[PDB]
Design a protein around this motif. Structure first.
Motif, PDB file in Angstrom:
ATOM      1  N   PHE A 143       0.825  -1.201   0.000  1.00 40.57           N
ATOM      2  CA  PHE A 143       0.000   0.000   0.000  1.00 40.57           C
ATOM      3  C   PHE A 143       0.871   1.268   0.000  1.00 40.57           C
ATOM      4  O   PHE A 143       2.015   1.270   0.481  1.00 40.57           O
ATOM      5  N   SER A 144       0.334   2.327  -0.601  1.00 38.09           N
ATOM      6  CA  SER A 144       1.015   3.622  -0.703  1.00 38.09           C
ATOM      7  C   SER A 144       0.011   4.749  -0.935  1.00 38.09           C
ATOM      8  O   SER A 144      -1.130   4.511  -1.367  1.00 38.09           O
ATOM      9  N   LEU A 145       0.464   5.969  -0.664  1.00 37.41           N
ATOM     10  CA  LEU A 145      -0.249   7.194  -0.983  1.00 37.41           C
ATOM     11  C   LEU A 145       0.499   7.883  -2.116  1.00 37.41           C
ATOM     12  O   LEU A 145       1.710   7.723  -2.225  1.00 37.41           O
ATOM     13  N   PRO A 146      -0.208   8.647  -2.967  1.00 39.10           N
ATOM     14  CA  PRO A 146       0.542   9.517  -3.875  1.00 39.10           C
ATOM     15  C   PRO A 146       1.202  10.634  -3.056  1.00 39.10           C
ATOM     16  O   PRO A 146       0.671  10.989  -2.008  1.00 39.10           O
TER      17      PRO A 146
ATOM     18  N   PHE B  46       1.091  13.448   3.781  1.00 36.22           N
ATOM     19  CA  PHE B  46       1.036  12.144   4.445  1.00 36.22           C
ATOM     20  C   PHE B  46       1.889  11.072   3.751  1.00 36.22           C
ATOM     21  O   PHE B  46       2.016  11.053   2.520  1.00 36.22           O
ATOM     22  N   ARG B  47       2.449  10.180   4.558  1.00 37.93           N
ATOM     23  CA  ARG B  47       3.094   8.961   4.080  1.00 37.93           C
ATOM     24  C   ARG B  47       2.529   7.776   4.841  1.00 37.93           C
ATOM     25  O   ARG B  47       2.226   7.889   6.036  1.00 37.93           O
ATOM     26  N   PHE B  48       2.393   6.643   4.158  1.00 34.11           N
ATOM     27  CA  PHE B  48       2.001   5.398   4.815  1.00 34.11           C
ATOM     28  C   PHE B  48       3.123   4.892   5.711  1.00 34.11           C
ATOM     29  O   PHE B  48       4.292   4.844   5.298  1.00 34.11           O
ATOM     30  N   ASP B  49       2.764   4.544   6.945  1.00 33.74           N
ATOM     31  CA  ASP B  49       3.714   3.997   7.908  1.00 33.74           C
ATOM     32  C   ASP B  49       3.600   2.476   8.046  1.00 33.74           C
ATOM     33  O   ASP B  49       4.537   1.746   7.735  1.00 33.74           O
TER      34      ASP B  49
END
Ligand SMILES: [Mg+2]
Ligand SMILES: [Mg+2]
Lengths: 305, 305
Positions: free
Chosen positions: A4-7, A290-293
């Motif tokens: 999973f990731s965010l742009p 934001f970043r995925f942790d």
């Protein structure tokens, strides 16, 4: 499993998923129903409600004008899907995708381009309004009625509505961004809705991506809050990454300094909570994002804001 | 090297990168200058020209109205960047990002929301037009002049222009989508431009993503052609994959059947060529989309379309 990731996008590089304008700010709201239908997507890429992929489709209509009635909501617009295909009222959606999901008046412009026997290829455009309070606002059934500026320059031809902003009605029906329209009109119940969202852990509040949209007179602030921005929806739809748990822990980072400013919970059904008490407009650095942790569960305790 | 890729999107799931509307069709054109400035991005994610990331920013303006002059292009709008930051006329761009890149009239609406001491929070909105033929169209220098509908309901306040469509200007100034405006006005040369594009192999033509945008009167077809759609630009900006040669081979696939319908060259500077002779509107299946195949070079001979 695909990770999973965010742009990676700053606030001013994000589009509101409930109205076609940029995000202006982040806001967390005191608790006490949130049930918007645009801007709804799971983290593994399932669109919900009336959500579709194009920013220019949000609060837009496409179809043909077929009749006029002697009421304020004068012009009867039979809807197509935004891609021009025939709209099916029996499909399992609340309304055609892109339909506004709030009570109020949407102002913008209508445009026409003739086909068939009457002056094919001729065009016209003018200011128009759509009231989602109207008893003729029945998009689920397949039509809405328009108010326009010049009743003498409008034909029974293919028509597009391009939204520009919102407002209270001048007869006192207020702009209420969290009140759904009656998609099939008076005495009907809405169906196929994306579910309501709320915090379910003590000390948590929803976090919104907020825009101040244009208004057409008066002092309304034009606030439209969305759960996740349109580019996140587009990204999740592409990626379809499996959700490993019910909550993705995300961190708001300042890339200039590399510091994490605060953390938040991104729930699998596509909304964010933070640990705070009270209404609070965030004021954070312009390059922040934001970043995925990591994947955590519903009972994970967030660092307080 | 990080692998290059395209987003997986059908034509009706794509946005024109030169005007904020969906793509309608694919079109290849006879040879003989193409030098549009919106919708410009390298395959490794470098935005060029006046290109920015939001569909709602294309052909939009943001700023403050500061003066009025006694002629048709009456209202003087001092520009900001679309994110509200101060515009610097010395930056290495042709104009503020999002500025229209064609000769003609863009019609839409203006909206205002007062700040400061004079009735802060008060709003108004109305129809407006921006002519890119105007000697006051000088966005590189920091301003454009507006034509509006009601000169008596407009203030020296923060202003946004939301585009809706295009048209010919009257008196013999036609809508010409391949003619750049003079971004600094008469007798000045445009600078910091994205380069012109053309096929460099015999028997090849450009392939365009085509929209028929709204017009405000008359019979103009509203054709705006872009080199790559906005979602591809957004994707390349995110991915930043190294370009392994000057040319990417892409295939148009029907996911229903798994068949490849035709192939094309996707060039490093962000445009497509096909092997065909003559103007030709493609008619292909609704679920069709391009996929990246492999890195090739200038000597690769495309299969005829
Ligand atoms: Mg991430
Ligand atoms: Mg691909």
């Amino acid at each position: 499993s695909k990770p999973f990731s965010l742009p990676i996008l700053t606030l001013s590089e994000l589009t509101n998923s409930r109205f076609p304008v940029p995000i202006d700010s982040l806001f967390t709201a005191q608790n006490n129903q949130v049930q918007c239908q645009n801007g709804r997507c799971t983290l593994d890429g399932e669109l919900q409600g009336t959500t579709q992929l194009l920013p220019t489709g949000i609060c837009a209509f496409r179809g043909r004008v077929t009749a006029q009635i002697n009421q304020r909501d004068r012009w009867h617009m039979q809807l197509q899907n935004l891609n021009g295909t025939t709209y099916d009222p029996t499909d399992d959606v609340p309304a055609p995708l892109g339909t506004p999901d709030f009570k109020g008046v949407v102002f913008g412009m209508v445009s026409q381009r003739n086909v068939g026997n009457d002056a094919p290829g001729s065009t016209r455009a003018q200011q128009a309004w759509v009231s989602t309070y109207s008893p003729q606002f029945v998009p689920k059934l397949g039509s809405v009625n328009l108010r326009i500026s010049d009743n003498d320059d409008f034909q029974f031809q293919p028509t597009k509505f391009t939204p520009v902003g919102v407002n209270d009605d001048d007869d006192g029906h207020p702009f209420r961004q969290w009140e759904l329209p009656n998609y099939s009109g008076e005495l009907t119940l809405n169906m196929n809705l994306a579910p309501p969202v709320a915090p379910n852990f003590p000390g948590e509040q929803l976090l919104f991506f907020r825009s101040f949209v244009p208004c057409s007179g008066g002092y309304n602030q034009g606030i439209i809050d969305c759960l996740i921005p349109q580019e996140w929806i587009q990204h999740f739809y592409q990626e379809s990454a499996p959700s490993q748990s019910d909550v993705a822990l995300i961190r708001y980072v300042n890339p200039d300094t590399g510091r994490t400013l605060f953390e938040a919970k991104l729930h699998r059904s596509g909304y964010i909570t933070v640990a705070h008490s009270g209404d609070y407009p965030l004021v954070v650095p312009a390059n922040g994002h934001f970043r995925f942790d990591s994947w955590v569960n519903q009972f994970y305790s967030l660092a307080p804001m």
